[PDB]
Amino acid sequence: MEGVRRAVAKFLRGGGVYEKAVDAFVKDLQRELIKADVNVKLVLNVTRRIKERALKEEPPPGVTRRDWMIKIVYEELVKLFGGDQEPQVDPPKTPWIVLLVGVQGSGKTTTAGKLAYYYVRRGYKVGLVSSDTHRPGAYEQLKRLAEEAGAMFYGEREGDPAEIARRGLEDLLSRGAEIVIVDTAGRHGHGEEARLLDEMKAIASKVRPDEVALVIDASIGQKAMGLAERFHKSTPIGSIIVTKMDGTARGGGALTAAAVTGARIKFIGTGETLGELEPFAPRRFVARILGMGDLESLLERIKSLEEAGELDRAAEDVLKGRITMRTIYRQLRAMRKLGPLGKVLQMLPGASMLASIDEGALKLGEEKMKRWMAIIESMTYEELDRPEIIDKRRMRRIAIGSGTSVDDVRELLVYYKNLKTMMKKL
Ligand SMILES: Nc1nc2c(ncn2[C@@H]2O[C@H](COP(=O)(O)OP(=O)(O)O)[C@@H](O)[C@H]2O)c(=O)[nH]1
Ligand SMILES: [Mg+2]
């Protein structure tokens, strides 16, 4: 979906009345999701998640209205596309048996090859297994991709598919396969789909798969609900892999099947070559939809401002004479993740004037701030409150706990006192 990029760009720039830009942006986005099918119910949910946040949350001090709204559209689109932060690209355990399931034509055998390569390159010993008995040239197809992918192979063109699959499993485990992908039929002869289901369930029983992956094409927006229910009944789905995300695209049906089985989309099929297969990371995918350039610019543009806001309070809290070890600790943290301060977009009330009294207040090194932070972390809660209590014995104890000089804990201490003096005026 490419119109959505243009919408973000119109919204982010092409000004006019703010609220008219957001009603229009929500409108564009909604049209754009529907065009990618998705599911009206899933589209009216994402817009309500966005409204609720827009009503309860307000841009943090300094952040523009628009920057904050895209940050809300992104985060909630991420949730819509699963994206609960769960990539899980490596299997969690030693031998990992993957049963592919799906209807013929969707890209199952291609996905088997693409999937074998992917794990080979990540340094896994991969075997493929041809269980498909009904499609002619299945054995040979998988054969090609297995050597093409640099993965071991085992198949039989004829027999009980369950026993072919059990045999291919044993063969490849014997030859030290750490991952085994079991390719399957997507049609039982003419098109008796209910013999196909009983075949998957039987293969599954003999094989004991660690992950049943449903392989689906990005061309069943509305029909993705049913397909998933049928396959989920026979072999409970644990993965979804979405094929044919090239040329004329779709995909919104993916996250309908995602919903029905409660299964994650682990891999996207984006072409015809072995190589054309990358994991599905929602954070990154929606970022591409929204416009990867803008979106990452906008999230930093916000995080800078939230940093400067901490420095704002830290400088302000000094200038109102409220300086403490907790103020300085928050001040250093803020200064550290920021850099050598600003000049282009300094834009700070406190920090401007703070440096305009003592230049050497906002001119500490990285290391000098990092040592001072370690120091504060080693002071007692009573010391944090009353640093004047810190005699020679304490000064010493502090130096040990934080790997520093008894004179270092003096430098901070003076800094504290020296800052505190100035803001008393004359
Ligand atoms: N464009 C594109 N084509 C694909 C993709 N995955 C599979 N195909 C094609 O889908 C067709 C059916 O492939 P196959 O793997 O035989 O499907 P199966 O019956 O489920 O095994 C072939 O023409 C493949 O080249 C993909 O990610 N993108
Ligand atoms: Mg096939």
PDB file of N, CA and C in Angstrom, residues 192-283:
ATOM      1  N   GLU A 192     -10.701 -33.385  -3.319  1.00  0.00           N
ATOM      2  CA  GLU A 192     -11.335 -33.817  -2.047  1.00  0.00           C
ATOM      3  C   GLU A 192     -10.469 -33.269  -0.900  1.00  0.00           C
ATOM      4  N   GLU A 193     -10.722 -32.011  -0.514  1.00  0.00           N
ATOM      5  CA  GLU A 193      -9.951 -31.221   0.488  1.00  0.00           C
ATOM      6  C   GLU A 193      -9.981 -31.906   1.861  1.00  0.00           C
ATOM      7  N   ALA A 194     -10.941 -32.795   2.121  1.00  0.00           N
ATOM      8  CA  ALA A 194     -11.179 -33.396   3.452  1.00  0.00           C
ATOM      9  C   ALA A 194     -10.351 -34.663   3.578  1.00  0.00           C
ATOM     10  N   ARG A 195      -9.798 -35.154   2.468  1.00  0.00           N
ATOM     11  CA  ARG A 195      -8.819 -36.270   2.521  1.00  0.00           C
ATOM     12  C   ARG A 195      -7.441 -35.642   2.776  1.00  0.00           C
ATOM     13  N   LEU A 196      -7.169 -34.511   2.121  1.00  0.00           N
ATOM     14  CA  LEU A 196      -5.979 -33.639   2.356  1.00  0.00           C
ATOM     15  C   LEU A 196      -5.836 -33.317   3.854  1.00  0.00           C
ATOM     16  N   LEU A 197      -6.913 -32.877   4.511  1.00  0.00           N
ATOM     17  CA  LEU A 197      -6.911 -32.553   5.962  1.00  0.00           C
ATOM     18  C   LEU A 197      -6.537 -33.808   6.745  1.00  0.00           C
ATOM     19  N   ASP A 198      -7.156 -34.940   6.422  1.00  0.00           N
ATOM     20  CA  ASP A 198      -6.898 -36.214   7.143  1.00  0.00           C
ATOM     21  C   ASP A 198      -5.447 -36.644   6.866  1.00  0.00           C
ATOM     22  N   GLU A 199      -4.879 -36.231   5.729  1.00  0.00           N
ATOM     23  CA  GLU A 199      -3.484 -36.589   5.367  1.00  0.00           C
ATOM     24  C   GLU A 199      -2.494 -35.811   6.258  1.00  0.00           C
ATOM     25  N   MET A 200      -2.724 -34.493   6.406  1.00  0.00           N
ATOM     26  CA  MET A 200      -1.936 -33.554   7.254  1.00  0.00           C
ATOM     27  C   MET A 200      -1.965 -34.047   8.710  1.00  0.00           C
ATOM     28  N   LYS A 201      -3.164 -34.297   9.237  1.00  0.00           N
ATOM     29  CA  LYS A 201      -3.393 -34.810  10.612  1.00  0.00           C
ATOM     30  C   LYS A 201      -2.624 -36.116  10.837  1.00  0.00           C
ATOM     31  N   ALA A 202      -2.482 -36.949   9.811  1.00  0.00           N
ATOM     32  CA  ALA A 202      -1.870 -38.294   9.920  1.00  0.00           C
ATOM     33  C   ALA A 202      -0.350 -38.107   9.894  1.00  0.00           C
ATOM     34  N   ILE A 203       0.142 -37.384   8.886  1.00  0.00           N
ATOM     35  CA  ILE A 203       1.567 -36.958   8.788  1.00  0.00           C
ATOM     36  C   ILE A 203       1.975 -36.348  10.124  1.00  0.00           C
ATOM     37  N   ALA A 204       1.168 -35.415  10.628  1.00  0.00           N
ATOM     38  CA  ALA A 204       1.449 -34.682  11.883  1.00  0.00           C
ATOM     39  C   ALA A 204       1.630 -35.695  13.015  1.00  0.00           C
ATOM     40  N   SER A 205       0.776 -36.712  13.070  1.00  0.00           N
ATOM     41  CA  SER A 205       0.766 -37.703  14.176  1.00  0.00           C
ATOM     42  C   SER A 205       2.067 -38.515  14.153  1.00  0.00           C
ATOM     43  N   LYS A 206       2.493 -38.966  12.972  1.00  0.00           N
ATOM     44  CA  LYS A 206       3.749 -39.747  12.811  1.00  0.00           C
ATOM     45  C   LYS A 206       4.969 -38.841  13.070  1.00  0.00           C
ATOM     46  N   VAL A 207       4.917 -37.577  12.641  1.00  0.00           N
ATOM     47  CA  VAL A 207       6.115 -36.697  12.579  1.00  0.00           C
ATOM     48  C   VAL A 207       6.326 -35.980  13.914  1.00  0.00           C
ATOM     49  N   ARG A 208       5.252 -35.600  14.613  1.00  0.00           N
ATOM     50  CA  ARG A 208       5.260 -34.779  15.859  1.00  0.00           C
ATOM     51  C   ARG A 208       5.943 -33.430  15.608  1.00  0.00           C
ATOM     52  N   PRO A 209       5.375 -32.549  14.755  1.00  0.00           N
ATOM     53  CA  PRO A 209       6.068 -31.322  14.369  1.00  0.00           C
ATOM     54  C   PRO A 209       6.116 -30.299  15.518  1.00  0.00           C
ATOM     55  N   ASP A 210       7.230 -29.568  15.600  1.00  0.00           N
ATOM     56  CA  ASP A 210       7.486 -28.537  16.641  1.00  0.00           C
ATOM     57  C   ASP A 210       6.753 -27.242  16.232  1.00  0.00           C
ATOM     58  N   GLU A 211       6.494 -27.059  14.938  1.00  0.00           N
ATOM     59  CA  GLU A 211       5.926 -25.829  14.335  1.00  0.00           C
ATOM     60  C   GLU A 211       5.166 -26.263  13.077  1.00  0.00           C
ATOM     61  N   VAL A 212       3.832 -26.187  13.076  1.00  0.00           N
ATOM     62  CA  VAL A 212       3.026 -26.327  11.833  1.00  0.00           C
ATOM     63  C   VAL A 212       2.887 -24.934  11.216  1.00  0.00           C
ATOM     64  N   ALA A 213       3.428 -24.720  10.029  1.00  0.00           N
ATOM     65  CA  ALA A 213       3.362 -23.417   9.336  1.00  0.00           C
ATOM     66  C   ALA A 213       2.284 -23.507   8.265  1.00  0.00           C
ATOM     67  N   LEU A 214       1.296 -22.623   8.318  1.00  0.00           N
ATOM     68  CA  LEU A 214       0.313 -22.422   7.234  1.00  0.00           C
ATOM     69  C   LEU A 214       0.936 -21.506   6.187  1.00  0.00           C
ATOM     70  N   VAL A 215       1.090 -21.980   4.962  1.00  0.00           N
ATOM     71  CA  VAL A 215       1.642 -21.151   3.863  1.00  0.00           C
ATOM     72  C   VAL A 215       0.461 -20.655   3.035  1.00  0.00           C
ATOM     73  N   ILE A 216       0.319 -19.332   2.939  1.00  0.00           N
ATOM     74  CA  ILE A 216      -0.825 -18.638   2.275  1.00  0.00           C
ATOM     75  C   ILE A 216      -0.246 -17.599   1.329  1.00  0.00           C
ATOM     76  N   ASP A 217      -0.963 -17.382   0.227  1.00  0.00           N
ATOM     77  CA  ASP A 217      -0.652 -16.317  -0.757  1.00  0.00           C
ATOM     78  C   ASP A 217      -1.335 -15.014  -0.286  1.00  0.00           C
ATOM     79  N   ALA A 218      -0.744 -13.858  -0.602  1.00  0.00           N
ATOM     80  CA  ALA A 218      -1.356 -12.517  -0.416  1.00  0.00           C
ATOM     81  C   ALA A 218      -2.433 -12.271  -1.484  1.00  0.00           C
ATOM     82  N   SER A 219      -3.463 -13.122  -1.571  1.00  0.00           N
ATOM     83  CA  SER A 219      -4.552 -12.990  -2.579  1.00  0.00           C
ATOM     84  C   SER A 219      -5.846 -13.602  -2.052  1.00  0.00           C
ATOM     85  N   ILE A 220      -6.001 -13.718  -0.733  1.00  0.00           N
ATOM     86  CA  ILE A 220      -7.261 -14.222  -0.106  1.00  0.00           C
ATOM     87  C   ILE A 220      -7.605 -13.324   1.096  1.00  0.00           C
ATOM     88  N   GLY A 221      -7.840 -12.043   0.826  1.00  0.00           N
ATOM     89  CA  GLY A 221      -8.201 -11.062   1.860  1.00  0.00           C
ATOM     90  C   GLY A 221      -9.362 -11.582   2.673  1.00  0.00           C
ATOM     91  N   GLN A 222     -10.457 -11.909   1.982  1.00  0.00           N
ATOM     92  CA  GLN A 222     -11.774 -12.240   2.595  1.00  0.00           C
ATOM     93  C   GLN A 222     -11.843 -13.753   2.875  1.00  0.00           C
ATOM     94  N   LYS A 223     -11.101 -14.563   2.113  1.00  0.00           N
ATOM     95  CA  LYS A 223     -11.159 -16.050   2.186  1.00  0.00           C
ATOM     96  C   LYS A 223     -10.086 -16.583   3.151  1.00  0.00           C
ATOM     97  N   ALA A 224      -9.320 -15.689   3.788  1.00  0.00           N
ATOM     98  CA  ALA A 224      -8.217 -16.042   4.711  1.00  0.00           C
ATOM     99  C   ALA A 224      -8.777 -16.548   6.040  1.00  0.00           C
ATOM    100  N   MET A 225      -9.986 -16.111   6.410  1.00  0.00           N
ATOM    101  CA  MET A 225     -10.671 -16.538   7.661  1.00  0.00           C
ATOM    102  C   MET A 225     -10.890 -18.054   7.628  1.00  0.00           C
ATOM    103  N   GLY A 226     -11.549 -18.539   6.569  1.00  0.00           N
ATOM    104  CA  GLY A 226     -12.017 -19.934   6.443  1.00  0.00           C
ATOM    105  C   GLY A 226     -10.862 -20.910   6.331  1.00  0.00           C
ATOM    106  N   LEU A 227     -10.028 -20.717   5.307  1.00  0.00           N
ATOM    107  CA  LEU A 227      -8.786 -21.493   5.027  1.00  0.00           C
ATOM    108  C   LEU A 227      -8.060 -21.815   6.350  1.00  0.00           C
ATOM    109  N   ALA A 228      -7.828 -20.794   7.179  1.00  0.00           N
ATOM    110  CA  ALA A 228      -7.122 -20.895   8.479  1.00  0.00           C
ATOM    111  C   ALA A 228      -7.884 -21.828   9.420  1.00  0.00           C
ATOM    112  N   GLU A 229      -9.210 -21.674   9.555  1.00  0.00           N
ATOM    113  CA  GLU A 229     -10.074 -22.520  10.442  1.00  0.00           C
ATOM    114  C   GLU A 229      -9.920 -23.990  10.020  1.00  0.00           C
ATOM    115  N   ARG A 230     -10.063 -24.262   8.734  1.00  0.00           N
ATOM    116  CA  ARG A 230      -9.988 -25.645   8.212  1.00  0.00           C
ATOM    117  C   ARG A 230      -8.648 -26.274   8.601  1.00  0.00           C
ATOM    118  N   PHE A 231      -7.542 -25.615   8.266  1.00  0.00           N
ATOM    119  CA  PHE A 231      -6.184 -26.183   8.460  1.00  0.00           C
ATOM    120  C   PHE A 231      -5.857 -26.239   9.952  1.00  0.00           C
ATOM    121  N   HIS A 232      -6.341 -25.266  10.714  1.00  0.00           N
ATOM    122  CA  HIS A 232      -6.084 -25.152  12.174  1.00  0.00           C
ATOM    123  C   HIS A 232      -6.755 -26.310  12.923  1.00  0.00           C
ATOM    124  N   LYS A 233      -7.835 -26.857  12.364  1.00  0.00           N
ATOM    125  CA  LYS A 233      -8.617 -27.951  12.985  1.00  0.00           C
ATOM    126  C   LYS A 233      -7.751 -29.207  12.949  1.00  0.00           C
ATOM    127  N   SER A 234      -7.215 -29.549  11.774  1.00  0.00           N
ATOM    128  CA  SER A 234      -6.472 -30.816  11.500  1.00  0.00           C
ATOM    129  C   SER A 234      -5.079 -30.767  12.141  1.00  0.00           C
ATOM    130  N   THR A 235      -4.356 -29.671  11.925  1.00  0.00           N
ATOM    131  CA  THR A 235      -2.991 -29.431  12.446  1.00  0.00           C
ATOM    132  C   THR A 235      -2.944 -28.019  13.019  1.00  0.00           C
ATOM    133  N   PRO A 236      -3.212 -27.850  14.344  1.00  0.00           N
ATOM    134  CA  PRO A 236      -3.100 -26.545  15.003  1.00  0.00           C
ATOM    135  C   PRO A 236      -1.929 -25.706  14.476  1.00  0.00           C
ATOM    136  N   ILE A 237      -2.235 -24.563  13.858  1.00  0.00           N
ATOM    137  CA  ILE A 237      -1.227 -23.650  13.253  1.00  0.00           C
ATOM    138  C   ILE A 237      -0.436 -22.947  14.356  1.00  0.00           C
ATOM    139  N   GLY A 238       0.880 -22.853  14.174  1.00  0.00           N
ATOM    140  CA  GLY A 238       1.823 -22.178  15.080  1.00  0.00           C
ATOM    141  C   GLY A 238       2.552 -21.075  14.347  1.00  0.00           C
ATOM    142  N   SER A 239       2.593 -21.139  13.017  1.00  0.00           N
ATOM    143  CA  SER A 239       3.243 -20.117  12.164  1.00  0.00           C
ATOM    144  C   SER A 239       2.339 -19.761  10.978  1.00  0.00           C
ATOM    145  N   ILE A 240       2.502 -18.553  10.426  1.00  0.00           N
ATOM    146  CA  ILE A 240       1.937 -18.178   9.098  1.00  0.00           C
ATOM    147  C   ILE A 240       3.058 -17.572   8.272  1.00  0.00           C
ATOM    148  N   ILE A 241       3.138 -17.994   7.022  1.00  0.00           N
ATOM    149  CA  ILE A 241       4.139 -17.498   6.049  1.00  0.00           C
ATOM    150  C   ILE A 241       3.311 -16.979   4.887  1.00  0.00           C
ATOM    151  N   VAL A 242       3.546 -15.742   4.462  1.00  0.00           N
ATOM    152  CA  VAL A 242       2.707 -15.101   3.417  1.00  0.00           C
ATOM    153  C   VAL A 242       3.556 -14.934   2.156  1.00  0.00           C
ATOM    154  N   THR A 243       3.116 -15.575   1.065  1.00  0.00           N
ATOM    155  CA  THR A 243       3.800 -15.635  -0.252  1.00  0.00           C
ATOM    156  C   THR A 243       3.183 -14.631  -1.239  1.00  0.00           C
ATOM    157  N   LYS A 244       3.934 -14.254  -2.281  1.00  0.00           N
ATOM    158  CA  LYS A 244       3.470 -13.409  -3.414  1.00  0.00           C
ATOM    159  C   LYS A 244       3.172 -11.988  -2.904  1.00  0.00           C
ATOM    160  N   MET A 245       4.171 -11.386  -2.249  1.00  0.00           N
ATOM    161  CA  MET A 245       4.226  -9.956  -1.856  1.00  0.00           C
ATOM    162  C   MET A 245       5.159  -9.235  -2.835  1.00  0.00           C
ATOM    163  N   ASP A 246       4.921  -9.441  -4.139  1.00  0.00           N
ATOM    164  CA  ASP A 246       5.630  -8.789  -5.278  1.00  0.00           C
ATOM    165  C   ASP A 246       4.628  -8.367  -6.359  1.00  0.00           C
ATOM    166  N   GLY A 247       5.049  -7.413  -7.198  1.00  0.00           N
ATOM    167  CA  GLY A 247       4.211  -6.701  -8.180  1.00  0.00           C
ATOM    168  C   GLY A 247       3.002  -6.071  -7.510  1.00  0.00           C
ATOM    169  N   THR A 248       1.843  -6.194  -8.157  1.00  0.00           N
ATOM    170  CA  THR A 248       0.484  -5.996  -7.579  1.00  0.00           C
ATOM    171  C   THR A 248       0.379  -6.743  -6.237  1.00  0.00           C
ATOM    172  N   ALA A 249       0.431  -6.017  -5.110  1.00  0.00           N
ATOM    173  CA  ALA A 249       0.483  -6.577  -3.737  1.00  0.00           C
ATOM    174  C   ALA A 249      -0.917  -6.576  -3.104  1.00  0.00           C
ATOM    175  N   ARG A 250      -1.039  -7.232  -1.941  1.00  0.00           N
ATOM    176  CA  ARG A 250      -2.254  -7.296  -1.075  1.00  0.00           C
ATOM    177  C   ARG A 250      -1.772  -7.491   0.380  1.00  0.00           C
ATOM    178  N   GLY A 251      -2.119  -8.599   1.046  1.00  0.00           N
ATOM    179  CA  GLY A 251      -1.514  -8.992   2.330  1.00  0.00           C
ATOM    180  C   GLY A 251      -2.450  -8.816   3.504  1.00  0.00           C
ATOM    181  N   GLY A 252      -3.358  -7.845   3.469  1.00  0.00           N
ATOM    182  CA  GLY A 252      -4.220  -7.541   4.627  1.00  0.00           C
ATOM    183  C   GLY A 252      -4.990  -8.754   5.134  1.00  0.00           C
ATOM    184  N   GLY A 253      -5.149  -9.782   4.294  1.00  0.00           N
ATOM    185  CA  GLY A 253      -5.791 -11.067   4.646  1.00  0.00           C
ATOM    186  C   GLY A 253      -4.912 -11.905   5.560  1.00  0.00           C
ATOM    187  N   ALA A 254      -3.603 -11.841   5.365  1.00  0.00           N
ATOM    188  CA  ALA A 254      -2.613 -12.407   6.304  1.00  0.00           C
ATOM    189  C   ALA A 254      -3.108 -12.199   7.741  1.00  0.00           C
ATOM    190  N   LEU A 255      -3.313 -10.938   8.150  1.00  0.00           N
ATOM    191  CA  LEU A 255      -3.497 -10.588   9.588  1.00  0.00           C
ATOM    192  C   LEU A 255      -4.948 -10.850  10.036  1.00  0.00           C
ATOM    193  N   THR A 256      -5.787 -11.387   9.141  1.00  0.00           N
ATOM    194  CA  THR A 256      -7.103 -11.992   9.478  1.00  0.00           C
ATOM    195  C   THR A 256      -6.859 -13.421   9.973  1.00  0.00           C
ATOM    196  N   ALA A 257      -6.088 -14.208   9.213  1.00  0.00           N
ATOM    197  CA  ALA A 257      -5.690 -15.599   9.554  1.00  0.00           C
ATOM    198  C   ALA A 257      -4.825 -15.581  10.823  1.00  0.00           C
ATOM    199  N   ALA A 258      -3.937 -14.583  10.926  1.00  0.00           N
ATOM    200  CA  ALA A 258      -3.142 -14.287  12.138  1.00  0.00           C
ATOM    201  C   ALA A 258      -4.066 -14.274  13.356  1.00  0.00           C
ATOM    202  N   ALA A 259      -5.148 -13.495  13.258  1.00  0.00           N
ATOM    203  CA  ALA A 259      -6.169 -13.317  14.318  1.00  0.00           C
ATOM    204  C   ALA A 259      -6.827 -14.663  14.665  1.00  0.00           C
ATOM    205  N   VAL A 260      -7.280 -15.417  13.655  1.00  0.00           N
ATOM    206  CA  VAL A 260      -8.166 -16.618  13.798  1.00  0.00           C
ATOM    207  C   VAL A 260      -7.435 -17.740  14.549  1.00  0.00           C
ATOM    208  N   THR A 261      -6.197 -18.040  14.162  1.00  0.00           N
ATOM    209  CA  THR A 261      -5.360 -19.108  14.766  1.00  0.00           C
ATOM    210  C   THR A 261      -4.568 -18.559  15.964  1.00  0.00           C
ATOM    211  N   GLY A 262      -4.515 -17.226  16.113  1.00  0.00           N
ATOM    212  CA  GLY A 262      -3.714 -16.501  17.122  1.00  0.00           C
ATOM    213  C   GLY A 262      -2.232 -16.624  16.829  1.00  0.00           C
ATOM    214  N   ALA A 263      -1.889 -16.902  15.561  1.00  0.00           N
ATOM    215  CA  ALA A 263      -0.544 -17.296  15.075  1.00  0.00           C
ATOM    216  C   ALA A 263       0.178 -16.075  14.529  1.00  0.00           C
ATOM    217  N   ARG A 264       1.499 -16.074  14.643  1.00  0.00           N
ATOM    218  CA  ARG A 264       2.345 -14.949  14.209  1.00  0.00           C
ATOM    219  C   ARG A 264       2.685 -15.194  12.741  1.00  0.00           C
ATOM    220  N   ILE A 265       2.840 -14.109  12.012  1.00  0.00           N
ATOM    221  CA  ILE A 265       3.407 -14.128  10.648  1.00  0.00           C
ATOM    222  C   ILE A 265       4.923 -14.089  10.815  1.00  0.00           C
ATOM    223  N   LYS A 266       5.602 -15.195  10.510  1.00  0.00           N
ATOM    224  CA  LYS A 266       7.050 -15.350  10.768  1.00  0.00           C
ATOM    225  C   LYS A 266       7.862 -14.936   9.544  1.00  0.00           C
ATOM    226  N   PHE A 267       7.323 -15.096   8.339  1.00  0.00           N
ATOM    227  CA  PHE A 267       8.091 -14.912   7.080  1.00  0.00           C
ATOM    228  C   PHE A 267       7.179 -14.406   5.970  1.00  0.00           C
ATOM    229  N   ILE A 268       7.740 -13.520   5.144  1.00  0.00           N
ATOM    230  CA  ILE A 268       7.070 -12.890   3.972  1.00  0.00           C
ATOM    231  C   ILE A 268       7.734 -13.469   2.725  1.00  0.00           C
ATOM    232  N   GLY A 269       6.915 -13.915   1.775  1.00  0.00           N
ATOM    233  CA  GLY A 269       7.351 -14.342   0.435  1.00  0.00           C
ATOM    234  C   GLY A 269       7.300 -13.168  -0.519  1.00  0.00           C
ATOM    235  N   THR A 270       8.464 -12.688  -0.956  1.00  0.00           N
ATOM    236  CA  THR A 270       8.590 -11.524  -1.867  1.00  0.00           C
ATOM    237  C   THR A 270       9.455 -11.904  -3.072  1.00  0.00           C
ATOM    238  N   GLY A 271       9.016 -12.903  -3.847  1.00  0.00           N
ATOM    239  CA  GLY A 271       9.521 -13.189  -5.201  1.00  0.00           C
ATOM    240  C   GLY A 271       9.626 -14.672  -5.479  1.00  0.00           C
ATOM    241  N   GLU A 272      10.468 -15.037  -6.447  1.00  0.00           N
ATOM    242  CA  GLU A 272      10.519 -16.387  -7.056  1.00  0.00           C
ATOM    243  C   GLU A 272      11.850 -17.070  -6.724  1.00  0.00           C
ATOM    244  N   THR A 273      12.872 -16.305  -6.369  1.00  0.00           N
ATOM    245  CA  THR A 273      14.224 -16.842  -6.076  1.00  0.00           C
ATOM    246  C   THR A 273      14.248 -17.317  -4.623  1.00  0.00           C
ATOM    247  N   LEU A 274      15.072 -18.332  -4.371  1.00  0.00           N
ATOM    248  CA  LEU A 274      15.424 -18.874  -3.035  1.00  0.00           C
ATOM    249  C   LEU A 274      15.671 -17.739  -2.034  1.00  0.00           C
ATOM    250  N   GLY A 275      16.442 -16.720  -2.442  1.00  0.00           N
ATOM    251  CA  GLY A 275      16.865 -15.571  -1.613  1.00  0.00           C
ATOM    252  C   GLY A 275      15.690 -14.713  -1.170  1.00  0.00           C
ATOM    253  N   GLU A 276      14.687 -14.539  -2.032  1.00  0.00           N
ATOM    254  CA  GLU A 276      13.519 -13.646  -1.797  1.00  0.00           C
ATOM    255  C   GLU A 276      12.659 -14.173  -0.631  1.00  0.00           C
ATOM    256  N   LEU A 277      13.182 -14.126   0.600  1.00  0.00           N
ATOM    257  CA  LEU A 277      12.401 -14.451   1.825  1.00  0.00           C
ATOM    258  C   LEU A 277      13.029 -13.833   3.087  1.00  0.00           C
ATOM    259  N   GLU A 278      12.358 -12.840   3.676  1.00  0.00           N
ATOM    260  CA  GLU A 278      12.826 -12.178   4.923  1.00  0.00           C
ATOM    261  C   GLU A 278      11.758 -12.361   5.991  1.00  0.00           C
ATOM    262  N   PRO A 279      12.176 -12.441   7.275  1.00  0.00           N
ATOM    263  CA  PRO A 279      11.224 -12.486   8.379  1.00  0.00           C
ATOM    264  C   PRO A 279      10.306 -11.249   8.353  1.00  0.00           C
ATOM    265  N   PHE A 280       9.175 -11.354   9.037  1.00  0.00           N
ATOM    266  CA  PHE A 280       8.171 -10.277   9.149  1.00  0.00           C
ATOM    267  C   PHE A 280       8.347  -9.676  10.531  1.00  0.00           C
ATOM    268  N   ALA A 281       8.922  -8.468  10.601  1.00  0.00           N
ATOM    269  CA  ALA A 281       9.035  -7.597  11.797  1.00  0.00           C
ATOM    270  C   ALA A 281       8.065  -6.422  11.639  1.00  0.00           C
ATOM    271  N   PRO A 282       6.886  -6.436  12.309  1.00  0.00           N
ATOM    272  CA  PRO A 282       5.910  -5.338  12.223  1.00  0.00           C
ATOM    273  C   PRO A 282       6.476  -3.919  12.400  1.00  0.00           C
ATOM    274  N   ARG A 283       7.167  -3.645  13.500  1.00  0.00           N
ATOM    275  CA  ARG A 283       7.920  -2.375  13.704  1.00  0.00           C
ATOM    276  C   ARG A 283       8.534  -1.913  12.364  1.00  0.00           C
TER     277      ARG A 283
END
